[PDB]
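Re: Re: ligand-bound prediction request (bumping)

Still looking for help on this. To restate: I need the protein modeled with magnesium ion bound, output as structure tokens. Inputs repeated here so nobody has to scroll up.
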Amino acid sequence: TEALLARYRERAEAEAKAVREKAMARLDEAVALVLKEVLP
Amino acid sequence: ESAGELLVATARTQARGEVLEEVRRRVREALEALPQKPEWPEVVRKLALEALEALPGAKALVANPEDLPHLEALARERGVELQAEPALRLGVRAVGAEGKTQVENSLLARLDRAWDALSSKVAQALWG
Amino acid sequence: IPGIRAQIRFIQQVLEQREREDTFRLKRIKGKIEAREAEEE
Amino acid sequence: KKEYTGITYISGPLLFVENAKDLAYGAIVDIKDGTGRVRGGQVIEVSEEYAVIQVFEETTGLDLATTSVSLVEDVARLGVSKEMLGRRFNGIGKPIDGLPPITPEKRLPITGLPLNPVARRKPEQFIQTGISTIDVMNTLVRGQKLPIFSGSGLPANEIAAQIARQATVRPDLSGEGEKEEPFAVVFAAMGITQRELSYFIQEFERTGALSRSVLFLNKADDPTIERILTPRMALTVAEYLAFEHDYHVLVILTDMTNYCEALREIGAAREEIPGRRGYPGYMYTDLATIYERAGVVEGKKGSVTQIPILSMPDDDRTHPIPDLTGYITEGQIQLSRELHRKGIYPPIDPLPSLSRLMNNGVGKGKTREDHKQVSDQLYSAYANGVDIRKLVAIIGEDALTENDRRYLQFADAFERFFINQGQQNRSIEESLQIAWALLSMLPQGELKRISKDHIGKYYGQKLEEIWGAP
Amino acid sequence: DLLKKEYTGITYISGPLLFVENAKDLAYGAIVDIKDGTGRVRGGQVIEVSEEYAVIQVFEETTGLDLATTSVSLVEDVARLGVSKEMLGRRFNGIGKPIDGLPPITPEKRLPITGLPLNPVARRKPEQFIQTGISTIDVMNTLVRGQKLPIFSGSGLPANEIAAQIARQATVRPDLSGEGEKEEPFAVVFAAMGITQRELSYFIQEFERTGALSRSVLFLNKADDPTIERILTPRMALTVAEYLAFEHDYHVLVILTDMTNYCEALREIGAAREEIPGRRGYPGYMYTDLATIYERAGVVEGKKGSVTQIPILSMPDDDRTHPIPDLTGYITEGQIQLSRELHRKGIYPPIDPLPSLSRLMNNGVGKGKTREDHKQVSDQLYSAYANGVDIRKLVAIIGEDALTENDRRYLQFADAFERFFINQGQQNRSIEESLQIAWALLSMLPQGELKRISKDHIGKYYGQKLEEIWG
Amino acid sequence: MIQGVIQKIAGPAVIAKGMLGARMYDICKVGEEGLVGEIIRLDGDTAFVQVYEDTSGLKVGEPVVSTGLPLAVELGPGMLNGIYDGIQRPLERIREKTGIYITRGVVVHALDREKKWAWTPMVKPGDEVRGGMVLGTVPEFGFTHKILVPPDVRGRVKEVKPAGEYTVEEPVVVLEDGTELKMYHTWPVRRARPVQRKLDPNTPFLTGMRILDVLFPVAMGGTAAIPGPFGAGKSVTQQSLAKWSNADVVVYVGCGERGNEMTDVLVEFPELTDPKTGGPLMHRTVLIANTSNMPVAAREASIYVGVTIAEYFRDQGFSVALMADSTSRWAEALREISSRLEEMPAEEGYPPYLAARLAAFYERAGKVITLGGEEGAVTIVGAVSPPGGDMSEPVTQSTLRIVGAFWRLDASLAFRRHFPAINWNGSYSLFTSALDPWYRENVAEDYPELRDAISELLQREAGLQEIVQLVGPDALQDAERLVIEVGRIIREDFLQQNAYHEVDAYCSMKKAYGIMKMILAFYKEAEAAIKRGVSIDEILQLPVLERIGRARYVSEEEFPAYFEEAMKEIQGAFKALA
Amino acid sequence: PVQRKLDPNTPFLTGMRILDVLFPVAMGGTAAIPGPFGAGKSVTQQSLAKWSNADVVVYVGCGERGNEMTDVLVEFPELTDPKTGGPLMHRTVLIANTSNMPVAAREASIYVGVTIAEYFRDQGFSVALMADSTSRWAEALREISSRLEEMPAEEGYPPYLAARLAAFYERAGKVITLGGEEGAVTIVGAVSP
Ligand SMILES: Nc1ncnc2c1ncn2[C@@H]1O[C@H](COP(=O)(O)OP(=O)(O)OP(=O)(O)O)[C@@H](O)[C@H]1O
Ligand SMILES: Nc1ncnc2c1ncn2[C@@H]1O[C@H](COP(=O)(O)OP(=O)(O)O)[C@@H](O)[C@H]1O
Ligand SMILES: [Mg+2]
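Reply:
Sorry for the wait, this slipped through. Here it is.
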């Protein structure tokens, strides 16, 4: 059945949104970390 | 039954890849503003010292015209010639004595050289 | 059976002889290349 | 960073660079020409005066005035992670599926350190491949090295894909066991063509077997040094998973003949005198360093199992490649051209096949207590059947005794039902049921090698138990 | 052009080679003269030129040369031969100098001896059927005008007799094909490399007997002559042949006595130069070198002449897989292979038809050229003879008494074939006679066994018996 | 440009000094005669040049000039119905400028610069274009030659010529950036032309031979290799494929073979008829010729030129077939040049990179989605000439590992004049399974079953021959004798095929299906008869066996009625006895 | 060094009737045994270790497979010495080499084993030395000769193969040690064609 495929697509897009929301908080922390580390 | 699992895995992995590429774009656009910063002469002094310590018996130093004024003292102190080169940006170049070897200390090269090493820490900070 | 076995051993001898000759030729030409490089550069 | 511009020689696959004594032997370098294109290369010799670099790919546009060489890494390493499962790589770890690159947890040298002999333990548990002639008669045990010997037109790729798709562990037969033990497949293909590549991709994706697999695929038009590297990277991933995450991994190396040919070309490119029949003298050592990376370790719950696949150059088992592979592995599984031309798949010939560790992976507490005796009886009966099948062509069937006719019919039914299983996935119990149904064709008491208890317990079942759905 | 320059400064003499240092004015491939202290002059050719020195191969022995008195002078930048129409009936040694005592010929032209490749667009289809008078060639392995058809021989096998007989009897058949009825004889160019006195005397006597010496050009390099001269003899012979054929409308038949000696000389030079060998020590460029010789035959559009080649070579150990026969077969357009087994049984000529082949056969036979049943009869003979040989193998195991009647028929056919079709002796058979004998032999088999022949031909020709021809 | 002087001459190899700055595999002009060469080694200030022409008469000190570009071909209208040498020079114009011989230093253009072509533009000003898109159409011998953007050109159309007649040098389309796009373009022969995507092969390549089309099929985008000793029948088979295949365009490469063969093609093909279009057969063929006595180094270039032209025609949307007359000649040329370089040999003197070169050449075949969104294919059939017929030779062993089908020829079959002389026991095909749906839809619903039955019969006959070699045929039982005789019937009446017969030369798939059906029906009837006590010695003389044997020669359109009559006779000949 | 080598007068009693009766080996002699699969070679070798009158046993595995070496390294720590009832391992020395170990070790393994055996003999004991698969040692020797670019003889083996084999096998024998006592070394070499 394709209802299972629809459910899997729904959960995949939900997971993508959730991980993007997780990233958005510490995006700047990661940017600052790499900017500090690359410089001598 | 397994196509859905593959879809979920691909979506998660591509979202993570997008996040890391956004981080890389941000750090790339952050690095290019350093010459405006007043700390830039110290950065170029450090880069030139690193390049010359990485090239024993170096002949000359090659840099951007707008960044060589910050490096006039070091060349005379180290006993090497300094040259002008508009193509080189936000970094320094030292040409070996024989003329065959040379070194580079541009920041973008360092960034792309250390991005693989820092990617794990980036992921840990973002989602760990 | 003895005849075919003798033929097989004969053919093996021929092939091994040819292989040995080829090894000798390769050794000689490698020696010449090395001598030229190390003597005349 | 640091670049070298003193090129003094370009010819064939090699180039010489001056004042390069800071390059370590065996390092990986980038070669850039005037147009900005970058190529790969490996340092094969270092001297006080110059270094020798064997270039990957081709030297088409290079010159002595604009070419430069820079270091990439002192030692060839691979960054590994558990996210590699479900991914496809190009043979040097570059992704080829369009997904973002993985984030490594650690980087390890692809050439492996030897296992300490006192650290290994005895292999004692089997793997169910779903193929009757392997599970019943040539059982594959966890930690074994069991190759497949095939020919020119024989379908070894189909067998490899089927085994990768169907292989599994069976904890429920090992006492109570543990319901959860991870299983993964590492697939390495060397010098394959585009058709085979597409076939493998389709087979791995259409059934969901990709979700537990890692693929290293090297094409026939790719550089040969990548072909040399591919099995080592596959085994690095296998060792990492097995001995740091307690996985049960199965490694399949698609063609060792291509690897041997690549090794021969690489050796000749460095001006080395070949050994027997044109192959390098150290070929045995190289094959051993590849094969001996499998086994089971005391104190660890993981394992590595290998199924090398290689095509005999002229169906000649005397050839150096099969001969050297036989010395290092435990037995072989050999395909038959006759069975293939007769329309039987998979065309595995039981008579020349052999598994040298079978006795330890079967018995009571694993598989079933009748396994060894059933396999022995099947072997003897099939040998008798083929002999009588040969004799009947001369003397005719009417001249044969009743036992000979029964053996002949048994051999025919064995070939049609036990071997010709098609794309069917058979569990060990189903295979043993079919074996007992075939043995019941023979009269009781002729079963010399089976004990009376097992005969009483199992003999007498009719072929319609499987003939209802063969 | 007219001044003479001498290069002293020879630094090396060994075997067939000689190194001279300060000579960078020597073009690659030039011809030089080498003079020693006593004033004797020998020839040579430049095979490698550099700024440091030049390498020269000597066409004679090196006895008496020294590094103090010897001098080298240029002759010509490119090796050339002076050809003329008035050289028919003359004799020359391996390098073109007269040996018959007559004055040197006045050259009409000077042509390079390496020649030039023929443009495939300028070529033509070889079509004219040549009647050699030998049944195993005319019927089964037809030779057409413009073909390269070598003979594969052995140590004691009579290939020279076969070549002489073919040269004596060969003729075209204008009446069969309806062409312009003209009776111009073949012009024979004969090149010998390492030939012995016995063979050379036989050939000369045969040519004198047939009165063909007035239409022949001879290039003789005997077995005691210098070896390196053999690199030039085929080239000079083929230069003369091409000139005659494509500038005077002659039909030239070229015979090269033994290419094995040519390959021996080629291997000597190759080994002296440390060349990378092929199989069995022969140089890697032997295929190219042989192709530069064999490919000079054929016919050209818009011209009446032709060149036909009959090289003769001895397979070293009667081994067909030796490099010389292998490469020759890969280049030429068929071969006639002799059989030692047939020779021992008293059969002449001992041509084994199964390993033989003629690639251009289909162009020159068929309706309107020889007869409409030629090709099918040939195929039927081939199949029947092969079956006979197979049954010969069988009876060696299962005994003759256990045969059926069909196998006995095929066995008798094979025996009669060998004793009547192949074995003809020294006689000149027309194509009709050979076809008649072939049909007589095929009549032994049942009419229904002739699967390769159409029913019209079977109705027209089958039935007549062999005794009506003899007996 | 980089200019130097000759330093050393030895055969086809020239070492030039003062050549600092030259690049590898660049085209150079050697000497005052301007002979074409190619740089294959750089060493300090010197370069190693292999000359594609004869070098007799050159002197030390003559100039050498590097053009700075690799070997390339001109791709555009005017290539069909043409013959070229190893580096794409029209042989007709050489024959006009020079006499009957080929001389050095002749400079001619690959595409005729005087002919006018009817141009019909398809783009309009202001359209974005990409590499591989079609700009217009030019008619050529019944085809519609499509002008293509070069594979690596981007921009937007500024202006286009109106419909009319122009030469190939006319800049029909000009981009915004001012780059002029003519009817043709050049491409390096050592670079594979890019595609959009490879596709799986699911359509047969119809060769016209029963044995190849049935027992060992090759798909549309596949590769096949046909080795054998001299006299086996490689060239006849390849020319039969050229005459009778269903490919739109045929490219024939005669690398290092006899010139008489090229002459035979050039003389015959104008008189033959295209199987599908009905026009002259020569109008769909391109010949690249490099005979045995032509310069050695051009043998390598000829193969690349042929495959590049085939790839171009594939990019236009056709299905192309490429025949290579011998690759062993290419291997020998490599070996000779390697000897000149004084390298380290591998195996029988071959350079170590031979297998890589072969794999790169063979991997260019396949069915693709072109950059223009079309569908095309290239099929490669390459002949191999092992020394002495030894199949263990490195070239053959390298070829085994990359080709999809293997057609091995047998010397014993050729000696007894049984053709095509394919060694059934040594041949195979890997496309058999993938083509089954096509056979089911287009030939018959049970065709694979008949083919498998025929294969099983041949296998059984091969098995019995081992005993027959020991005890003779008469010692066998009756069923085994029947198997042997049916095997002989299959060998003589189905697998055999006359390339020179007027009807037997070409055989459709349905005719082969009918013949197989008749043979299987007869075998079933004979087995049933011997089951019930009918003597086998009486079966061999049944009147229908001759009709089965001669069913090959029936014309293609008469065949269905003949098949019906023969099937009814098969039923009767055993029903009447009962 | 030794003072003097003695004649093979006394037997090396292996405890197996067929070997001790029909095909005896003297103390200080040499014997060879092929290695067919499934013939129980390892059982016979460990029986030689357990029951023979040798005081000390030296086992050399030079190029064995990984799993075979695992089997032999697991089995011996379980055997029991009949003479004392304590572990058999208390009087044995094991030299182990797998296929992927360096070539030099595989080539020098048998020399190390025979030197240790000679030492224990010079102490005055009777030593049994068992070399498993000298064919693998020969393969290592062939590889080393190939790396040195030497002209082979027969099936690629170096021409000095027999000399090395003789140099290994001739160290066995019953001697009068430099201390005046008696000792012996017996060598059993497995050969696997
Ligand atoms: N001396 C013996 N006493 C009792 N049983 C024996 C003896 N020799 C052999 N066997 C039996 O026969 C089997 C021989 O096969 P197996 O593969 O196990 O032998 P192995 O000693 O490990 O030697 P190999 O590695 O040569 O096969 C043993 O496992 C054992 O069951
Ligand atoms: N299929 C065939 N049918 C009829 N004759 C053939 C066939 N194949 C080969 N021959 C004959 O055998 C000769 C062999 O030469 P050729 O076919 O070119 O093979 P090769 O390329 O191996 O020489 C040809 O002249 C040809 O006339
Ligand atoms: Mg050919």
